[PDB]
């Protein structure tokens, strides 16, 4: 407790020294709370005139044109402590899998060097405004090193005095860019190592891309064994645990000298002991302390989630296979028995789990897995939409199961080659290209974002019928060699190359799915899904608004180059059948 926090406590305190009153009426029942003082400030979702121009037959599409528009009693739940059986299980379960994880990989820390790159090309690495505008100054500036260096040696100290949570079924905990560097420091090299790649981890997907997971999931099909089991955890940043908390930290057991001492005090002084602040409109700043749940970066919350639910899936897996009876209590010859496995098997079933963060794929040995729920639901991992105790209900098919908000089909080219997709319902596509975030957008940038939703499309959804046309009607209505961008950054569509020569890297010659590398010459050679297949995923085709938006698309294209001006432009559009001639 306060030994901890109080020091950050302390601080806020005297900064607002006029305002300060401990209330009563403070809505608070699972964080302590510390004190109040006075504030006054809020970023809504902004249309993108280019793409909603292109894209005239969803304005009347109420699942598109109301994503447009406009749980914190969630946050405030408490997890119970897991049953001395369960703790061992994880114990266990952690021990084993950060020493598989770390066979090929060493511990090391990024360097301000690394942390200055990331900035100077807009990674969202959560932080503050105030001293400097932007990250991007405050990185050329030796003051603000100065102050990182008065909080490490505080760190090295076993203290900590600026690290403090900002609080904004999503909750995203800002820090000031010092706090993000020193936990960058300590435990970037997670994500910056690739430390769960597929290659590493058997059970991961970081960095595969959207072109790889559905061939992943293909790939565990293949296993003999049950259903394939896609169970949805109920907001899992809430359910994290000390007990996980401490799990995680075991990291530092893989470190050494400094590293060791950085990262033991990352966990210790920010993760397992938080400090955050709240906006309250009733509108004053509340200072609010607890020790479980996630709150981290995003980027270290990726990770730490990818390995928590890699541990709690083989140990369901375990329970499922009848490797312990109860979670009660572990004998001292089950606590041996789940060791062995791990030995014997563990890595065989990590190769039968696709997982990102909180979201996972499982095909376990067969179904006892579906009842198997005491170990899960004592780990606090409960799961969405689904009573307690009520077995789960798995995929027969690879191409039903959901993963990473999307599923897979299976495409046959012209030339006998199979491609595997990535599709999601298309008024979900259209209605996310739609939208921008943040203030003071050029023309220019408008259409500049318009491209990379455009181009995004060409490279993965090229196989629905109204993305193709609609991404070839924004890439002719966007000047040629204007450079797509983003705000929030694999990207392959990123780029002024030309997409069919990116869809040949990416979809033949970079693809070890496919062994014939014969390169397309046409996008007429690349396949869109059956007709009624892109009805079911929300294809507007047979429409009569849809037919007149086709036919008559170069009208729309030619008011929006209208608009932009007399610059550069290509017309994309006999790169299909229907508008070659
Ligand atoms: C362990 C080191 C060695 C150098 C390349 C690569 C191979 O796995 N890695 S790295 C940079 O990913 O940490
Ligand atoms: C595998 C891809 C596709 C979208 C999910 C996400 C999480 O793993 N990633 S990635 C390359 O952005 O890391
Ligand atoms: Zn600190
Ligand atoms: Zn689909």
């Given at each position: ?18 305002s ?5 009426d403070?809505p ?16 809504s979702?902004?249309?993108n005139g ?5 894209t005239?037959?969803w304005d009347?599409?109420?699942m598109?044109?109301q ?12 997890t ?11 114990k ?7 020493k598989?994880?770390?066979?090929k ?6 360097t ?44 090295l100290?076993?203290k ?18 010092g706090?993000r560097?020193?936990?960058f420091?300590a435990l ?11 290659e ?14 559905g ?13 394939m089991?896609?169970?949805d ?12 908390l ?7 057991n ?14 210790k ?10 906006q309250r409109?009733?509108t004053?700043?509340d ?13 270290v ?11 709690a ?25 789940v060791?062995?496995?791990l ?18 794929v ?29 077995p789960?209900?798995?995929?027969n ?17 012209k030339?006998?080659?199979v491609?595997?997709?990535p599709?999601?319902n298309?008024d979900?596509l259209?209605?996310?290209?739609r ?6 957008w ?8 318009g491209?990379?939703?455009?181009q ?5 959804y090229?196989?629905?019928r ?22 929030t950054?694999?990207?392959?569509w990123?780029?002024?190359?030309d997409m069919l020569?990116?869809?040949?890297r ?9 062994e ?12 869109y899904?059956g ?15 849809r ?35």
């Amino acid at each position: 407790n306060l030994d901890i926090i109080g020091k950050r406590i302390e601080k806020i305190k005297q900064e607002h020294e006029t305002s300060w009153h401990y209330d009563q009426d403070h809505p608070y029942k699972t964080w302590a709370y510390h004190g109040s003082y006075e504030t006054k400030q809020t970023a809504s979702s902004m249309v993108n005139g280019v793409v909603r121009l292109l894209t005239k037959p969803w304005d009347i599409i109420p699942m598109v044109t109301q994503m447009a528009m406009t749980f914190k009693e969630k946050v405030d739940t408490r997890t119970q402590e897991p049953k001395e059986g369960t703790k061992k299980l994880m114990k266990i379960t952690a021990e084993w899998l950060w020493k598989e994880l770390g066979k090929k990989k060493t511990p090391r820390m990024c360097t301000r060097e690394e942390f200055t790159r990331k900035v100077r090309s807009n990674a969202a690495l959560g932080a503050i405004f105030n001293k400097w505008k932007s990250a991007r100054e405050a990185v050329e500036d030796s003051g603000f090193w100065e102050l990182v260096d008065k909080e490490r040696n505080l760190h090295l100290e076993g203290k900590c005095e600026t690290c403090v949570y900002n609080m904004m079924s999503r909750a995203i905990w800002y820090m000031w860019l010092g706090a993000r560097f020193l936990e960058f420091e300590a435990l970037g090299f997670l994500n910056e190592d690739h430390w769960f790649s597929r290659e590493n981890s058997l059970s991961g997907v970081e960095g595969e891309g959207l072109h790889k997971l559905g061939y992943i999931l293909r790939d565990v099909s293949k296993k003999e064994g049950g259903a394939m089991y896609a169970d949805d955890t109920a907001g899992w940043d809430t359910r994290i645990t000390l007990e996980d908390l401490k799990n995680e930290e075991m990291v530092t057991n893989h470190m050494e000298g400094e590293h060791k001492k950085l990262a033991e005090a990352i966990f210790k002084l920010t993760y397992q002991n938080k400090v955050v602040r709240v906006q309250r409109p009733t509108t004053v700043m509340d200072i609010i302390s607890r020790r479980d749940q996630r709150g981290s970066g995003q980027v270290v919350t990726y990770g730490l989630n990818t390995f928590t639910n890699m541990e709690a899936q083989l140990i369901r897996q375990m329970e499922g296979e009848g490797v312990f009876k109860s979670i009660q209590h572990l004998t001292v010859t089950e606590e041996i028995a789940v060791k062995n496995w791990l030995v014997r098997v563990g890595r065989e079933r990590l190769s039968r789990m696709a997982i990102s963060g909180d979201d996972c794929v499982v095909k376990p040995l067969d179904d006892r897995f579906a009842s198997a729920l005491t170990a899960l639901n004592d780990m606090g991992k409960v799961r969405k939409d689904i009573q307690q105790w009520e077995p789960s209900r798995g995929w027969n098919d690879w191409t039903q199961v959901p993963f990473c908000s999307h599923h897979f089909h299976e495409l046959i080219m012209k030339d006998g080659r199979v491609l595997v997709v990535p599709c999601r319902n298309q008024d979900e596509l259209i209605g996310r290209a739609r939208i921008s975030q943040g203030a003071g957008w050029s023309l220019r940038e408008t259409a500049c974002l318009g491209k990379s939703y455009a181009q995004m499309w060409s490279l993965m959804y090229f196989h629905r019928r109204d993305l193709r046309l609609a991404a070839n009607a924004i890439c002719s209505a966007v000047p040629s060699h204007w450079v797509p961008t983003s705000r929030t950054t694999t990207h392959e569509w990123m780029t002024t190359e030309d997409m069919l020569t990116v869809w040949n890297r990416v979809w033949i010659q970079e693809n070890p799915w496919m062994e014939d590398k014969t390169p397309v010459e046409s996008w007429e050679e690349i396949p869109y899904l059956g007709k009624r297949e892109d009805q079911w995923c929300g294809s507007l085709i047979g429409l009569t608004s849809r037919a007149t938006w086709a036919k008559n698309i170069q009208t729309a294209i030619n008011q929006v180059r209208s608009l932009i001006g007399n610059e550069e432009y290509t017309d994309y559009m006999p790169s299909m059948k229907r508008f070659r001639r």
